[PDB]
């Protein structure tokens, strides 16, 4: 009779094969479409007098955006919907529960012309 | 069959043979968990006459209870 040598007095659970799931059927079988596309991210512009004076003074577009949108998604949506390059995004949750995004554009883009192209002012 | 011998033998609980088996087994069960799956009935004749079948979907558990 032979016996194996054990340097440790502790027995550990041996490593056995862990198979990846190979399901017989799909879990839902229709993937959900994008829950946050650019249209869902950007709800509408904000057109108060303060937001507008920010538009022609700070190169800033003020938007009401989805409460589920983070600064990355807001940056990506603005670039896609309006084809402007974004310098910075500041966000806040307004006292009415909506989210406001201050989206400052680069020096290469104006905020007046974009606001005009979108439609307000 | 053998189930008739098992049924008669199980009734002799205080014979030498069943007393030995009883002591060894009661130690074994105490070492295991309070509730644990049994791989098979230790009393095949008793399980049968209660309605156990040796087929997929019949399960035996072992449980101990404080007296």
């Amino acid at each position: 009779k032979a016996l194996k040598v054990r340097t440790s007095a502790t027995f550990r659970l041996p490593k056995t094969l862990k198979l990846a799931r190979a399901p017989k059927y799909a879990s839902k079988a229709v993937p959900h479409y994008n829950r946050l596309d650019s249209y869902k991210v950007i709800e509408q512009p904000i057109t108060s007098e303060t937001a507008m004076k920010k538009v022609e003074d700070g190169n800033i577009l003020v938007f009401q955006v989805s409460m589920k949108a983070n600064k990355y998604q807001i940056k990506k949506a603005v670039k896609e919907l309006y084809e402007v390059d974004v310098l910075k995004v500041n966000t806040l949750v307004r006292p009415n529960g909506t989210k406001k995004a201050y989206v400052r554009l680069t020096a290469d883009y104006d905020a007046l012309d974009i606001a005009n192209r979108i439609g307000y002012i | 069959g053998a189930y008739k011998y098992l049924e008669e033998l199980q009734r002799k609980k205080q014979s030498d043979v069943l007393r030995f088996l009883q002591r060894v087994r009661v130690w074994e069960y105490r070492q295991k968990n309070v509730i644990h799956r049994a791989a098979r009935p230790t009393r095949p004749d008793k399980a049968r006459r209660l309605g156990y079948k040796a087929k997929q979907g019949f399960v035996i558990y072992r449980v101990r209870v404080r007296r």
Partner: protein, 230 residues
């Protein structure tokens, strides 16, 4: 060599932190390993009533090899051969139709505990092999007595797995020959004689002797030192 020397380390107490050593003796095993080892231990520590420990008197290697050689000549039909002879029977029913006799009479090992016990009670069995490691042992513990009562030669033999492999099962727990062919009648008779000299002819004495009561290594050492000392 001028560049290699002898370090030798001092693996004594207080010096040279110990080297790796075989610690298998001190391994803390999982409880199921513990329970099966200590189950084997406790079953030989206690006194074993003769009805048990008549078992673990097992057919020794040479006549076990002989017995299983004779038995392997009478293996039951597998699924393949059974359906092949089913086709042969269908072919006869198509063309011959004697009565139902395309296939010839079979000579197969009988197995199944209920089947074998009834075979013994009817005195049809000519050799019975009992597995020595059935759990619960109640299923076979009466078999040597029944075989002795009914005049049926029996052998307690190592391996329900070994019995099972000659009947295409994982475990048979019992095997029996009720009849053989002429070419094996002499081999059956000589093996029955040796098996009787080993099991049935010792039954009256074996029934009187208790097993177990064996000590562990350390207790046995400390007993024989006090036997010598005082």
């Amino acid at each position: 060599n001028p560049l290699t020397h002898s370090t030798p380390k001092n693996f004594g107490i207080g010096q040279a932190v110990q080297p790796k050593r075989n610690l298998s003796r001190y391994v803390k095993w999982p409880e199921y390993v513990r329970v099966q080892r200590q189950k084997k231990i406790l079953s030989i520590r206690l006194k074993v009533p003769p009805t048990i420990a008549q078992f673990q008197y097992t057919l020794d290697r040479n006549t076990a090899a002989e017995t299983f050689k004779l038995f392997n000549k009478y293996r039951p039909e597998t699924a393949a051969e059974k359906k092949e002879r089913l086709t042969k029977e269908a072919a006869a029913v198509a063309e011959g139709k004697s009565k139902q006799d395309a296939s010839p009479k079979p000579y197969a090992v009988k197995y199944g505990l209920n089947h074998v016990v009834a075979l013994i009670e009817n005195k049809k069995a000519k050799l019975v092999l009992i597995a020595n490691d059935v759990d619960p042992i109640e299923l076979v513990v009466f078999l040597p007595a029944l075989c002795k009562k009914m005049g049926v030669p029996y052998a307690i033999v190592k391996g329900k797995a070994r019995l099972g492999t000659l009947v295409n099962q994982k475990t048979s727990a019992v095997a029996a020959l009720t009849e053989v062919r002429a070419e094996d009648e002499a081999a059956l008779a000589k093996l029955v004689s040796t098996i009787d000299a080993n099991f049935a002819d010792k039954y009256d004495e074996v029934k009187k002797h208790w097993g177990g009561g064996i000590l562990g290594n350390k207790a046995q050492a400390k007993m024989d030192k006090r036997a010598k000392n005082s």
